[PDB]
Design a protein around this ligand. Structure first.
Ligand code: UDP
Ligand code: UDP
Ligand code: GAL
Ligand code: GAL
Lengths: 264, 264
């Protein structure tokens, strides 16, 4: 493969590492051939969780079809579809080493943390995404790490005081005006099974505390996710390539690939 | 602390992450206040190993004095001094939480891997350096990770075919002319106790295989270190700030700090 050269950076236009030395994942920062080999040597299995409740079942077909084309191809994958309509889950043909389970539900942080023993035995990593999305380009093992969050596409150019963090100190999700690294979106986070269960257990415990206190955070689980990732910093951060809306935000030059996008 | 901004990189002049998404540690890439807190929450202990055999005992005083000023200050540190002259080890006054053991020896990879149970109980990380050096600036927890190597200061601007890897396929250290990421120096490597014992055990086993075969690698343990770190890629790479010789190479602009340097 091409020899990396220490005096020529590959991307000079964007921050590629956080101040706590976590990679920020942009096209041009990674050689996928190297990463794929490292992960295949461990026989890595990746869990992908998706909720499709009520009308949101309609999003599953495209979601799964497109995951088959772009998500962890070559690796073992277990889709977990949480739904109130198990008969509405479309039958999508999967690649080898890939499987899907339908979990019937009667919330997300709760539901993710007691499927607890199940995830620990079956997968190495867990990835938690919104269903009303499609994959348009490669989303692979470059994202895998103990704990990651994703930069919210509306706020990646913003200063922290503009971040729509929870601001009432009454709320467990509270983050002061002069604190904060990034604004992460709740639509795409993950990590090791152990780290995702810690995060979701913490968010769940914090939401219950707010509830028993008569307050709900301004952006609900996304508020608590941001407070967690402030105090427990992610080991990788995904760039907005991994969570975008072309309709609302177009295709700027700084995004070489649009990998996982909102469905119009 | 200052808010990192995703569209303004802190260093645009150098590569700050490897193609396998390991940070390359340069001044300006890390907020030490954040790192120090993360490491202190774990009560981290760092082991530092140094060989001082024959005339090399003369280097210890400056080495230790300067480590006290610059190496992991605020953290727990255990110096391990391997020497054939235990009475020649200077008595240097240490900061709180810091200790030194003198290990008498009658090689390095061997000696590091059977002090094996001893390191596993006493430290979390191990750092292995040459003694004829001095610390001139901060060398701290930014370097800590499962496995790291350091860019050789003579070869960081070089193409791979110029790297003085072992080139005879007769040798276990053999690396083909079209392979290779970097040229790491043997003078400064480390990692978790488990990873450093794996590396040193592998290098030791590989050296014995070459010996039983009548061949010694061109640069001896540094050759085997480079072959190991090719096949087991480091989780961080230290920039030349961490291993320099001002006499031979000066002080280029791209080095904002000269942290650990050869003694003239
Ligand atoms: O009626 C609903 C509401 C929410 N969701 C799940 O939770 C996510 C977020 O819901 P919301 O509509 O508030 O956010 P959106 O996805 O529209 O940005 C959805 O993607 C689904 O994955 C669902 O399945 N059914
Ligand atoms: O007589 C010796 C030779 C080597 N060394 C140890 O192994 C390192 C490398 O030895 P060499 O002189 O070959 O390399 P140098 O340090 O001069 O670059 C030294 O720093 C010491 O830490 C030693 O202690 N005594
Ligand atoms: O400010 C936070 C909000 O930003 C909106 O753009 C987004 O649609 C919401 O889901 C939430 O993330
Ligand atoms: O080419 C490899 C060699 O480079 C020299 O500059 C150095 O003094 C040696 O210790 C060895 O690392």
């Amino acid at each position: 493969y091409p020899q990396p050269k220490v005096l020529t950076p590959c991307r000079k236009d964007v921050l590629v590492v956080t101040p706590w030395l976590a990679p920020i994942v942009w096209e041009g920062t990674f050689n996928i051939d190297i990463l794929n080999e490292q992960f295949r040597l461990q026989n890595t299995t990746i869990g992908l969780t998706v909720f499709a409740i009520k009308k949101y079942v309609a999003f599953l077909k495209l979601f799964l079809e497109t995951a088959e084309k772009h998500f962890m191809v070559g690796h073992r994958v277990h889709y977990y579809v949480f739904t109130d309509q198990p008969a509405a889950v479309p039958r999508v043909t999967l690649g080898t080493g890939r499987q899907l389970s339908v979990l019937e539900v009667g919330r997300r942080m709760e539901m993710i943390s007691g499927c607890e023993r199940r995830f620990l035995s079956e997968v190495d990593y867990l990835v938690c995404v919104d269903v009303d999305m499609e994959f348009r380009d490669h989303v692979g093992v470059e994202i895998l790490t103990p704990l990651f969050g994703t930069l919210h596409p509306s706020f990646y150019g913003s200063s922290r005081e503009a971040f729509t963090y929870e601001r009432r100190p009454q709320s467990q999700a509270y983050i002061p005006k002069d604190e904060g690294d990034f604004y992460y979106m709740g639509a795409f986070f993950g990590g090791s099974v152990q780290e995702v269960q810690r995060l979701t257990r913490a968010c769940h415990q914090a939401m219950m505390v707010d509830q028993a206190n008569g307050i709900e955070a301004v952006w609900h689980d996304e508020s608590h996710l941001n407070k967690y990732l402030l105090r427990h910093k992610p080991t990788k951060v995904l760039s907005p390539e991994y969570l975008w809306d072309q309709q609302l935000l177009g295709w700027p030059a700084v995004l070489r690939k649009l990998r996982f996008t909102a469905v119009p």
